[PDB]
Copies of this chain bind each other. A is one copy, B any other.
Amino acid sequence: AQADIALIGLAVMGQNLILNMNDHGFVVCAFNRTVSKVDDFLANEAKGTKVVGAQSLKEMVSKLKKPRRIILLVKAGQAVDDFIEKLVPLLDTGDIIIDGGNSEYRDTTRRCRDLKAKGILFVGSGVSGGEEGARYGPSLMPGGNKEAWPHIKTIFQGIAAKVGTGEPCCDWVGDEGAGHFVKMVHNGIEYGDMQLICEAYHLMKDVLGMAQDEMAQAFEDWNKTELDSFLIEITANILKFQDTDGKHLLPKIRDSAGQKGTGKWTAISALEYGVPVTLIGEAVFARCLSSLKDERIQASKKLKGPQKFQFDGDKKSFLEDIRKALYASKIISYAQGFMLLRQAATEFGWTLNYGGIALMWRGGCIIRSVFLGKIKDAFDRNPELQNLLLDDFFKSAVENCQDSWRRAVSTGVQAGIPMPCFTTALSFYDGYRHEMLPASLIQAQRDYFGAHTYELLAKPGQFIHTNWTG
């Protein structure tokens, strides 16, 4: 037994994780369902490394120092269950199987319980960062059986992305594949930040009438305040990018985004669990509206916008209201995301590391930002915060931004500028802060025509029915 860990699945993702562990001094045993990729991978990108290979599962298991640690990077679905069924008879009680693919969390939970009964430690881990991330420092979100954490903590944290304060972007998420659920919520939050930036870029282009490189300079200055993020860095670089001829390239790009993007499952999980994750759903619906390019071309010729509009104020003042509205809406988005994480932890009985979860998103992911570090700090003070809109940093940040927040929303509404995420974040904030909501009228209606009963504000849990008619 001379190899520390093994990895099944010799794809660009699996290869980079193996080379990453090799660059940190770990002997990795490579393997693939088609053994032909083993000797192929060992004589190219692994030529001259400590990486060893195996042509059978029994050989691979026999070359690992106990407790044996297997990383699965195969396609999510039946392929993962096939390798598990083929590994269980070969493993001893206490061995570790790690699924690093984009597996559905309900499957990871099922595999975690079934393998715990057989004495095998199963871990479902989320890996974000693409190929370049998996090569030098990916974001790892492990979860499942904490008994396997003391063994994989050394290798995972070593190869994980470094955040800047020395800590690794890899900690224990929770039990029964909570990391794959965290990986899902991570995908939905990505849709919000990107769409939120697009709404801000829309305001600068149609209300302030700015030029491309002038908008890129605004984002570069916006990337020096509270909005430090990789999505804003690339946004400024995209706006300033000049094609073959001096003209810019972005106005030449088609106006259609993805339609079957993975971010919708975050909003579907919100509807399944009854959590008001409104901003993520608007970002998903916004991309689907973009795919209707031909309908929007014909609609622009027939449907008209707001008449007699003119911007009276200050171009340089409105450029600071858009920023604070973009920052306040982003706070509402992450507040809803942790509400979905909280409800899932309650439904299954998980104990999530909300502070560490924000750290794992802060390095290697696309949504990485120092703003995520402030979420980590907020979850370092109470680790019981039922809502990010209930802590000092976020509560104060809205109090300064909300005045310019409503100014950007009101101006964009009268200007005819689509801001679905700006408005739904402001609508959710006003709704969440109201002790009394008009939903009592909804209950009165459902009881009126459907006799769906209702409760009294002072006597909960007791459902009564009113005649209403006679």
Residues of A whose CB lies within 8 Å of any CB of B are 12, 130-132, 194-195, 197-199, 201-202, 205, 230-231, 234-235, 237-238, 241, 249-260, 264, 267-268, 270-272, 274-278, 281-282, 284-292, 295-300, 302-307, 366, 386-387, 389-390, 395, 398-399, 402-403, 406, 409-410, 413-414, 416-420, 423-424, 426-446, 448-452, 454-458, 460, 466, 468
Q: How far is the CB of A60 from chain B (nearest CB, A)?
A: 28
Q: Report the separation of the CA atoms of residues A440 and B418 in the bound assembly, to the nearest whole angstrom.
A: 14
> Per a CB cutoff under 8 Å, which of B272, B387, B445 touches A238?
B445
Q: Report the separation of the CA atoms of residues A131 and B467 in the bound assembly, to the nearest whole angstrom.
A: 13
- Closest 10 A-B residue pairs measured CB to CB? A290-B439, A198-B438, A418-B431, A254-B455, A300-B435, A423-B423, A303-B433, A257-B439, A420-B427, A255-B439
Q: How far is the CB of A354 from chain B (nearest CB, A)?
A: 16
Given contacts A390-B298, A437-B255, contact A272 B268 (CB under 8 A): yes
Q: How far is the CB of A434 from chain B (nearest CB, A)?
A: 6
Chain B, Cβ-Cβ closest to A430: B418
Given contacts A276-B285, A285-B277, A285-B278, contact A387 B440 (CB under 8 A): no
Q: Report the separation of the CA atoms of residues A449 and B402 in the bound assembly, to the nearest whole angstrom.
A: 31
Chain B, Cβ-Cβ closest to A423: B423
> Per a CB cutoff under 8 Å, which of B205, B277, B288, B468 touches A275?
B288
Chain B, Cβ-Cβ closest to A300: B435
Chain B, Cβ-Cβ closest to A422: B427
Chain B, Cβ-Cβ closest to A277: B285
Contacts of A419 in B (CB 8 A): 427
Known pairs A130-B450, A286-B431, A410-B413. 6 more at Cβ < 8 A? Answer: A202-B438, A275-B288, A296-B432, A300-B434, A303-B395, A307-B402
Q: Report the separation of the CA atoms of residues A437 and B432 in the bound assembly, to the nearest whole angstrom.
A: 30
Q: Report the separation of the CA atoms of residues A257 and B466 in the bound assembly, to the nearest whole angstrom.
A: 17
Given contacts A274-B260, A300-B433, contact A403 B285 (CB under 8 A): no
Chain B, Cβ-Cβ closest to A448: B234
Chain B, Cβ-Cβ closest to A129: B449
Chain B, Cβ-Cβ closest to A270: B285
B432 & A423 in contact (Cβ 8 Å cutoff)? no
A428 & B420 in contact (Cβ 8 Å cutoff)? yes
Q: Report the separation of the CA atoms of residues A257 and B285 in the bound assembly, to the nearest whole angstrom.
A: 24
Contacts of A277 in B (CB 8 A): 285
Q: Report the separation of the CA atoms of residues A423 and B438 in the bound assembly, to the nearest whole angstrom.
A: 16
14 A-B residue pairs with Cβ-Cβ distance under 8 Å, sorted by A, are A194-B445, A194-B446, A235-B445, A250-B441, A253-B454, A255-B435, A275-B288, A276-B292, A282-B427, A285-B428, A287-B442, A298-B390, A299-B389, A418-B434
B250 & A444 in contact (Cβ 8 Å cutoff)? yes
B272 & A304 in contact (Cβ 8 Å cutoff)? no
Chain B, Cβ-Cβ closest to A260: B274
Contacts of A460 in B (CB 8 A): 254
Contacts of A429 in B (CB 8 A): 303, 305
Contacts of A205 in B (CB 8 A): 438
Q: How far is the CB of A296 from chain B (nearest CB, A)?
A: 6
Q: How far is the CB of A342 from chain B (nearest CB, A)?
A: 10
Q: How far is the CB of A195 from chain B (nearest CB, A)?
A: 6
Q: Report the separation of the CA atoms of residues A335 and B386 in the bound assembly, to the nearest whole angstrom.
A: 37
Q: Report the separation of the CA atoms of residues A437 and B257 in the bound assembly, to the nearest whole angstrom.
A: 10
Q: Report the separation of the CA atoms of residues A240 and B5 in the bound assembly, to the nearest whole angstrom.
A: 72
A395 & B253 in contact (Cβ 8 Å cutoff)? no
Q: How far is the CB of A430 from chain B (nearest CB, A)?
A: 4
Q: Report the separation of the CA atoms of residues A77 and B391 in the bound assembly, to the nearest whole angstrom.
A: 43
Contacts of A199 in B (CB 8 A): 438
Q: How far is the CB of A315 from chain B (nearest CB, A)?
A: 19
Q: How far is the CB of A251 from chain B (nearest CB, A)?
A: 7
Q: How far is the CB of A401 from chain B (nearest CB, A)?
A: 12
